[PDB]
C-alpha cells in the first residue's frame, strides 16, 4: 500500500502550473509495448535518432492514435475549464452593490483592503462609535 499527498502552493508563474499539469498528464499515461517494439524492429538503427536524423516529415498516425490524442486533449480541456470553482451565493449577507460588476469589485476590494479597514467596519456596525 502506497500513499502520496500533492497540494499546490500559490500561482507564482504560468510555467510552474504548466509543469504541474504536465507531471499529472505524464504520470497518467500508460504505454503499450507491442506497438513500441513493433516500430523498434521496423525502424532499426534510426529508432534512436539525433537532432539531425532524417525522420522529420514522414510519420503518419493511424486512426486509433489520433483518437487517443483527441480524447486525452478533451479531458485536459475539461480539467482546465474547471479552474475557477464558483463559490456559492448566499443572500443573507447585507448586499453592498447595485450591480453585478459592482459586487465583484467589492469582493476584490475586500481581498486587498479587508485586512486594513477592520476598525472602521467595527465602528460602522457599532454605531459609528470609538
Amino acid at each position: 500500500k502506497k500513499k502520496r499527498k500533492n497540494p499546490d502552493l500559490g500561482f507564482s508563474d504560468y510555467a510552474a502550473a504548466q509543469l504541474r499539469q504536465y507531471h499529472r498528464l505524464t504520470k497518467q499515461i500508460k504505454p503499450d509495448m507491442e506497438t513500441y517494439e513493433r516500430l523498434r524492429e521496423k525502424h532499426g538503427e534510426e529508432f534512436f535518432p539525433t537532432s539531425n536524423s532524417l525522420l522529420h516529415g514522414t510519420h503518419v498516425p493511424s486512426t486509433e492514435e489520433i483518437d487517443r490524442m483527441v480524447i486525452d486533449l478533451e479531458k485536459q480541456i475539461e480539467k482546465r475549464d474547471k479552474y475557477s470553482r464558483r463559490r456559492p451565493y448566499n443572500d443573507d449577507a447585507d448586499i453592498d452593490y447595485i450591480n453585478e460588476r459592482n459586487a465583484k469589485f467589492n469582493k476584490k476590494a475586500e481581498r486587498f483592503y479587508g485586512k486594513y479597514t477592520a476598525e472602521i467596519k467595527q465602528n460602522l456596525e457599532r454605531g459609528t462609535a470609538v
Binding site: S12, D13, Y113
Partner: protein, 111 residues
C-alpha cells in the same frame, strides 16, 4: 501630423506623462510578473495628483514601494510643471501682456 499648438498643450502633456509611466512600469516589474496591472497603477497616479492638488496626504495601505516611489516622482514632476506654469502666467497677467480669459480663470484657480 497635427502640431501641439496652444489648445493641445495640457492634453499632450498628460498624454506623454502617462506613456512615460507605462514604459517605466513595463521595465520595473521583474521577470515573472503577469504583465497586466498597468491601468490600475495609472489610476493611482491620477489619484496621487488629485490628492496633491487637494493637499490631502496620499498613502495607499498596501502598495509596492517601487510603484509608490515612482508615482511620487512623476507627481512631483507634474507639480513642478503646474507651478512653473502658474508663475509664468501670473507674471504675464501682472505685466499686462496678452492672455486668454480662460487662462485668467485658470490662473486664479491655481493661485
Amino acid at each position: 501630423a497635427k502640431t501641439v499648438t496652444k489648445q493641445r498643450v495640457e492634453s499632450h502633456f498628460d498624454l506623454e506623462l502617462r506613456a512615460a509611466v507605462m514604459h517605466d512600469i513595463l521595465d520595473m516589474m521583474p521577470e515573472g510578473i503577469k504583465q497586466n496591472k498597468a491601468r490600475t497603477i495609472l489610476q493611482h497616479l491620477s489619484e496621487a495628483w488629485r490628492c496633491w492638488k487637494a493637499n490631502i496626504p496620499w498613502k495607499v495601505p498596501g502598495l509596492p514601494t517601487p510603484i509608490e516611489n515612482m508615482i511620487l516622482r512623476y507627481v512631483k514632476a507634474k507639480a513642478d510643471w503646474w507651478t512653473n506654469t502658474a508663475h509664468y502666467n501670473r507674471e504675464r497677467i501682472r505685466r499686462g501682456a496678452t492672455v486668454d480669459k480662460t487662462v485668467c480663470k485658470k490662473n486664479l484657480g491655481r493661485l
